[PDB]
Design a protein around this motif. Structure first.
Motif, PDB file in Angstrom:
ATOM      1  N   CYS A  72       0.803  -1.220   0.000  1.00 12.88           N
ATOM      2  CA  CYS A  72       0.000   0.000   0.000  1.00 12.88           C
ATOM      3  C   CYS A  72       0.839   1.273   0.000  1.00 12.88           C
ATOM      4  CB  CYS A  72      -0.899   0.026   1.206  1.00 12.88           C
ATOM      5  SG  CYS A  72      -1.918   1.510   1.219  1.00 12.88           S
TER       6      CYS A  72
ATOM      7  N   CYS B 117      -1.296   5.202   2.675  1.00 10.95           N
ATOM      8  CA  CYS B 117      -1.917   4.673   3.874  1.00 10.95           C
ATOM      9  C   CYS B 117      -2.439   5.732   4.828  1.00 10.95           C
ATOM     10  CB  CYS B 117      -0.950   3.783   4.614  1.00 10.95           C
ATOM     11  SG  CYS B 117      -1.823   2.584   5.646  1.00 10.95           S
TER      12      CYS B 117
ATOM     13  N   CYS C 200      -4.280   6.366   8.830  1.00 11.53           N
ATOM     14  CA  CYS C 200      -4.488   5.773  10.145  1.00 11.53           C
ATOM     15  C   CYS C 200      -4.979   6.787  11.153  1.00 11.53           C
ATOM     16  CB  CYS C 200      -3.179   5.260  10.692  1.00 11.53           C
ATOM     17  SG  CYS C 200      -2.434   3.948   9.737  1.00 11.53           S
TER      18      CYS C 200
ATOM     19  N   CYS D 245      -6.521   1.673  10.210  1.00  6.92           N
ATOM     20  CA  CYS D 245      -5.868   2.188   9.029  1.00  6.92           C
ATOM     21  C   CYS D 245      -6.522   1.627   7.792  1.00  6.92           C
ATOM     22  CB  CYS D 245      -4.406   1.785   9.019  1.00  6.92           C
ATOM     23  SG  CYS D 245      -3.396   2.327  10.434  1.00  6.92           S
TER      24      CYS D 245
ATOM     25  N   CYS E 264      -6.379   1.718   3.334  1.00  7.08           N
ATOM     26  CA  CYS E 264      -5.443   1.993   2.255  1.00  7.08           C
ATOM     27  C   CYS E 264      -6.113   2.649   1.048  1.00  7.08           C
ATOM     28  CB  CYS E 264      -4.766   0.701   1.833  1.00  7.08           C
ATOM     29  SG  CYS E 264      -3.666   0.886   0.405  1.00  7.08           S
TER      30      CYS E 264
ATOM     31  N   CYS F 221      -0.303  -0.383   8.680  1.00 13.52           N
ATOM     32  CA  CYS F 221      -0.195  -0.088   7.260  1.00 13.52           C
ATOM     33  C   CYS F 221       0.665  -1.117   6.569  1.00 13.52           C
ATOM     34  CB  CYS F 221       0.433   1.265   7.070  1.00 13.52           C
ATOM     35  SG  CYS F 221      -0.745   2.612   7.344  1.00 13.52           S
ATOM     36  N   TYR F 222       0.288  -1.562   5.382  1.00 17.43           N
ATOM     37  CA  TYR F 222       1.242  -2.327   4.589  1.00 17.43           C
ATOM     38  C   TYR F 222       2.406  -1.442   4.103  1.00 17.43           C
ATOM     39  CZ  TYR F 222      -2.253  -6.040   4.393  1.00 17.43           C
ATOM     40  OH  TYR F 222      -3.140  -7.029   4.754  1.00 17.43           O
TER      41      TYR F 222
END
Length: 58
Positions: A4, A7, A9, A17, A19, A53-54
């Protein structure tokens, strides 16, 4: 791989969070709820609200 770039959050423990980045035809491999424009090709976001988050992509 799920990644992602954009992101988001909430400030809170733990954080929720989402994306924001937007793919064509489908969401990434680990997306539960995927919401796409009804049109070919389709603009798909992943509306999941995971608590981390990725990492970016590519």
């Amino acid at each position: 791989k799920p990644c992602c770039d954009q992101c988001a959050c909430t400030k809170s423990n733990p954080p929720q969070c989402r994306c924001s980045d937007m793919r064509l035809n489908s969401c990434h491999s680990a997306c539960k709820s995927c919401i796409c424009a009804l049109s070919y090709p389709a603009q798909c976001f992943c509306v999941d609200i995971t608590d981390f988050c990725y990492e970016p992509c590519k």
